[PDB]
Subunit: 134 residues, 2 copies
């Protein structure tokens, strides 16, 4: 991917709280290890991102970098990419080794803005597998 | 490996402090990503192990398990295995995906107990690559 595809002007503090994985996509079929469900984001006062996820709860710390929408997690290098969020409804997030992207929503209310924007974002990226849940 | 090859009666509190990587060995040549140098161990009051290492300093948290010499780190599952230590001189430590083992010493004093015991421990395990440093 490119820095061109990451989000401009992210405020990491406003993504705090609960999220639900509506859908996932990945560059390689076997990737879906990156089959992980973001349940909560907890930014730190220092600007790092704690990720609570389901696989068993895992707690991951993605550290800030010089790119405000890109965090570094480990022995195996993984980056967390925030593609886009409105903070109140949806967050598009990618984890790179190579690439898995998740469509996160604040609540599973009947509304399809998040999934339209996920699908629009994936058009640019070479994905070989796509999942959507109930 | 087996639980039979992990250490009996580990006190994680006594491995606290500085260590030096004298030597590494691994199951697969390409493994030496697990080319990481343990510089410090910091056990927590809760019994988890913080690992400071050189690759750039990385800080890894290996959580306790029901096995007192085995800690769990992440998206990719890695276990840290303490094979053997006398706490004061040497620690034999393995990181599993599959397997890399390190010979750690408290100080680079002229003494070869650590390396004899590393080599004796590796006899049992299928290693294809071995490194030793100055």
């Amino acid at each position: 991917a490119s820095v061109t595809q990451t989000m401009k002007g992210l405020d990491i503090q406003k993504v705090a709280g609960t999220w639900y994985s509506l859908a996932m996509a990945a560059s390689d079929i076997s990737l879906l290890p990156l089959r992980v469900y973001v349940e909560e984001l907890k930014p730190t006062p220092e600007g790092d991102l704690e990720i609570l996820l389901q696989k068993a709860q895992k707690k991951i710390i993605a550290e800030k970098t010089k790119i405000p929408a890109v965090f570094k997690i480990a022995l195996n290098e993984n980056k967390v990419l925030v593609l886009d969020t409105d903070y109140k409804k949806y967050l598009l997030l990618c984890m790179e080794n190579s690439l898995a992207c998740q469509c996160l929503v604040r609540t599973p209310e009947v509304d399809d803005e998040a999934l339209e924007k996920f699908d629009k974002a994936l058009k640019a990226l070479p994905m070989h597998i796509r999942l959507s849940f109930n």
